[PDB]
Structure 1
Amino acid sequence: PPPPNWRQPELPEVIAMLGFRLDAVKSNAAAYLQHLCYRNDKVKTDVRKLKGIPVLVGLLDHPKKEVHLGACGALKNISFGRDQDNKIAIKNCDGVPALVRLLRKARDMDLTEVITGTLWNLSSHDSIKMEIVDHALHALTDEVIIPHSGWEHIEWESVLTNTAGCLRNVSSERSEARRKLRECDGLVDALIFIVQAEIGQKDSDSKLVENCVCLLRNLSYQVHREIPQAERSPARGYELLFQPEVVRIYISLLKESKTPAILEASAGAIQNLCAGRWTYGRYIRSALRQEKALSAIADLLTNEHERVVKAASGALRNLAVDARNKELIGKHAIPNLVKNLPGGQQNSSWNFSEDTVISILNTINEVIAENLEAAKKLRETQGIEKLVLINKSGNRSEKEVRAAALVLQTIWGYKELRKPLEKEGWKKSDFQVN
């Protein structure tokens, strides 16, 4: 008679075993399935085609943790990878509601970790974002963010990380998503609280901080137009997005963090809060044009990472629009901006992409628009050489050449900068905008 043995069943058998009466077979099959899918795109795709996904999703409702946790670990692996149809299939058999239903029942960290990791994987697909925003938002906030944040101490850092990563992804575009998240009771409060807690533990680099700050940057995007009754008793809810404290947090992250994505996100949130014409935008821009904050922001211009350089540029740009210590911005911004243009000894700026260079040029233009001393510091840093090098390039694009001409035409507006170039033989038409 037939002893037990180590034979490997075929995929279709494993999938059928998901429906065997014995819970222990279901759970071992789900587990084995998770293992088969691990780092194996082809297997993930075959599971979809064999119609395993709705089976796995059905098992989330199974009362026994071994089965539902087993099914979930498999879905997590299946929700990861290049075949985006695997994520869509999970959505199409109501995987998100099922994940959410299980989340509300979960009592343990390991299961909550797997559910939220799966949601984080799903949230990267654009077609699943509003599904998650509409069906998981409130469970993620009420079951995870608020209780584990410490807000009313911090714990379950890994689950919080997954969960903020998920909310960050789904809020990466769509005003409807930003508005829905901004409106969720306690969500903004607790994110700010988490980021403060971490900074207080001397953690300014964790993925948790990263996900929270990126999320906060998303919610700060267009807050001035999207806040209910844009018309602008303590601040609460989305009002916290533009109070002094969070602004101070971004600035402190600019000084303490070494992680490019966190520096970019913090500079980005500052940029977003500074973009709008509205009372709070004025307050925040005015506060940010002080010596310490300007230096914190300008210093990211010496960061070796392009995307950080670009973020600093955008932030500096929005500060310059209504600036009033013309000397200040000028002093803090111009030398580092000019260093990041091609045409000197800094190798890296010869390798920046077109969008970065245009960002810097536009920012330069804004900073010198009515600021003779800024224009002078430009001239003093050999930045005219660089503008001409860009403008007269035989290899850069029309947009980049034009961006350089714009700055040149602004420079041409000032008599004191004009006469010295005329002494070289330059005339205004050498630098036409087209």
Structure 2
Amino acid sequence: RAIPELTKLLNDEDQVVVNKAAVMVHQLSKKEASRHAIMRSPQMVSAIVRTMQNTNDVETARCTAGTLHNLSHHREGLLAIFKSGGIPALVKMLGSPVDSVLFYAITTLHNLLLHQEGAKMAVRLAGGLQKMVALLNKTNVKFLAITTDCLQILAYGNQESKLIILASGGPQALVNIMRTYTYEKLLWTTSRVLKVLSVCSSNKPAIVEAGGMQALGLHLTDPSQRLVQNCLWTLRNLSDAATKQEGMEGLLGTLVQLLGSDDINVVTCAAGILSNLTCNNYKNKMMVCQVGGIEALVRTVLRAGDREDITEPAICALRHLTSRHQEAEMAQNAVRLHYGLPVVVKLLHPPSHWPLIKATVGLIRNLALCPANHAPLREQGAIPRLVQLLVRAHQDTQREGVRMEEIVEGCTGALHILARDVHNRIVIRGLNTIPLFVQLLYSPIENIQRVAAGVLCELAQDKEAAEAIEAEGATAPLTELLHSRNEGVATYAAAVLFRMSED
């Protein structure tokens, strides 16, 4: 048109002159077709960009910037935005003080990433990532939301970008946002970038140390299901890196409650996270117990029935909670008080698979430490059932999902604890187990030799038993294990030989 002829002189203006020309071009970009005439003037497209890059008058920038945003709407519009090198300039503008500039710069960059092929690479190259991470302390939540989204777009399926974000202190910034704001769309775009980073090994620890678990935990009762969902699954993925944090009170309490959810996948998830977060951290165990975690976990087990994606994690947490902390005995008792003993013992049967059976035998072991559990467990038929799992396991080793060594250790270990009670001892040798426990002493696995010597040790406190054990020729292997490298093995062998010859 005759509008291309006007754009011509518009390209010039190289002085104080410029400052006005920008305002003029910017205003003409507002039209629907006056946005087209400027599309096929790459001289102008490239001038609009040069000016903004270089110009050190504030309003001049917002007029060039604004211009490009108008053009970033059409499929041919971004194309020339890219081809004219505007991207690196846009990204340069992310350092500006003027918020009117920043808003244009980020919205335009967004558009480009979503649609213009080559943007992603280009933005990374300009150092957009490190820019965008540093803007995460701006205060406009709409802006934060778009900024975090850009990051998500650049991070996605791109580990290099993930590592770069980690390096720029991205995790702490993202986590601060999760701690501070409540605006749904922002928490959503932020929970997404987080999720995407949480699949990076290096970012896990970093997210965690920055208070990522606690911050996610703050939004688990949010009404926005898409948000709760991102938090739960991100929490779960992080849970294994998170066992040493403090300040986990609120999160643990909420997880217990989530066990009551009607949503199955929320329940499985909550179990998993609880299972991990109860690993080894004694404070976490006490809190979970204090908010009524045993009762919830039992209940959850009953409800789940045969659903092993639920019972395995929940049984594991129960097991963590029934040993190695100040309230472990209280927890052992609670399982009995809340009718847990029959479901627990029942899980030793089909259709349970080995991993669940492993966890369950582990749980029963701890359960047996509580004297008040010796008789009730016996009544449920724990002993004959453990002995069967043991014998089976040992036969398989004599010639998956789990190794039968664990089941053999596990089972023997459980019986070792059940042998503390005198009537249990009678039921135990009762099943002709004493030869099996002696031949176990010869196992290559030291763990197995230990639990075997352990159960023999308890049994031997009774005279008949001790003669029985003596009759099996236990004295030979015991005397040898007396020099095992393994402390426990040697400690029990001494223990057993001691009791073998008392009189």
Q: Could you say whether these structures have the same fold, taking a TM-score greater than 0.5 normalized by the shorter chain as the test?
A: yes
**Residue 196 of structure 1: how far off its partner (Å):** 0.9
Is it true that 1:29 corresponds to 2:151 in the alignment? yes
SS of the residue 1:123 aligns to: helix
2:251 to 119, 122, 136: 136
**Residue 31 of structure 1: how far off its partner (Å):** 4.1
Measure, in 1, the Cα distance between the counterparts of 2:163 and 2:485.
42
**Residue 212 of structure 1: how far off its partner (Å):** 0.7
Is it true that 1:334 corresponds to 2:404 in the alignment? no
2:384 to 280, 292, 295: 295
Q: 1:363 to 1:272 in 2, by over 3 A?
A: same
> 1:13-412 residue pairs with structure 2 within 5 A?
13-14=128-129, 16-17=131-132, 19=135, 21=143, 23=145, 26-37=148-159, 44-60=162-178, 61=181, 63-65=183-185, 67-80=186-199, 82-83=201-202, 86-108=203-225, 110-125=226-241, 128-132=244-248, 134-142=249-257, 144-146=258-260, 148=261, 155-185=262-292, 187-199=293-305, 202-203=306-307, 205-206=308-309, 208-221=310-323, 226=327, 240-243=334-337, 245-256=339-350, 258-276=352-370, 281-282=371-372, 284-290=373-379, 292-301=381-390, 302-303=392-393, 304-324=403-423, 326-332=425-431, 333-342=433-442, 349-350=443-444, 352=445, 354-373=446-465, 375-376=467-468, 378=469, 383-384=472-473, 388-389=476-477, 391-392=479-480, 396-397=484-485, 399=487, 400-412=489-501
**Residue 327 of structure 1: how far off its partner (Å):** 3.0
Contact 1:31 1:70 in 2 (8 A): no
Identity of aligned residues (%): 21
Measure, in 2, the Cα distance between the counterparts of 1:309 and 1:112.
41
CA RMSD of aligned residues (A): 3.5
Unaligned runs of 5+ in 2: 1-41, 43-77, 80-115, 137-142, 394-402
Measure, in 1, the Cα distance between the counterparts of 2:312 and 2:379.
26
Scaled by the length of structure 2, what TM-score is found? Answer: 0.63
SS of the residue 1:104 aligns to: coil
1:238-287 deviation per Cα after TM superposition (whole angstroms, max 9, x unaligned):
964222721111111112364444323322322223214xxxx33x2012
Measure, in 1, the Cα distance between the counterparts of 2:381 and 2:441.
24
Measure, in 2, the Cα distance between the counterparts of 1:328 and 1:393.
27
Contact 1:331 1:374 in 2 (8 A): no
SS of the residue 2:220 aligns to: helix
**Residue 131 of structure 1: how far off its partner (Å):** 2.7
Number of residue pairs aligned between Structure 1 and Structure 2:
367
Measure, in 2, the Cα distance between the counterparts of 1:104 and 1:392.
60
SS of the residue 2:422 aligns to: coil
Contact 2:365 2:413 in 1 (8 A): yes
1:32-57 deviation per Cα after TM superposition (whole angstroms, max 9, x unaligned):
414324xxxx6544322111113332
Q: Which amino acid aligns with 1:157?
A: I
**Residue 210 of structure 1: how far off its partner (Å):** 1.3
Unaligned runs of 5+ in 1: 149-154, 231-236, 343-348, 415-434
| Equivalent residue, structure 2, for 1:420 | none
1:314-350 deviation per Cα after TM superposition (whole angstroms, max 9, x unaligned):
22122111222543111334344345332xxxxxx33
1:188-227 deviation per Cα after TM superposition (whole angstroms, max 9, x unaligned):
333212211222xx33x32x2111111112222268x638
SS of the residue 2:423 aligns to: coil
Measure, in 2, the Cα distance between the counterparts of 1:325 and 1:22.
65
SS of the residue 1:289 aligns to: helix
Scaled by the length of structure 1, what TM-score is found? Answer: 0.72
Measure, in 2, the Cα distance between the counterparts of 1:407 and 1:22.
68
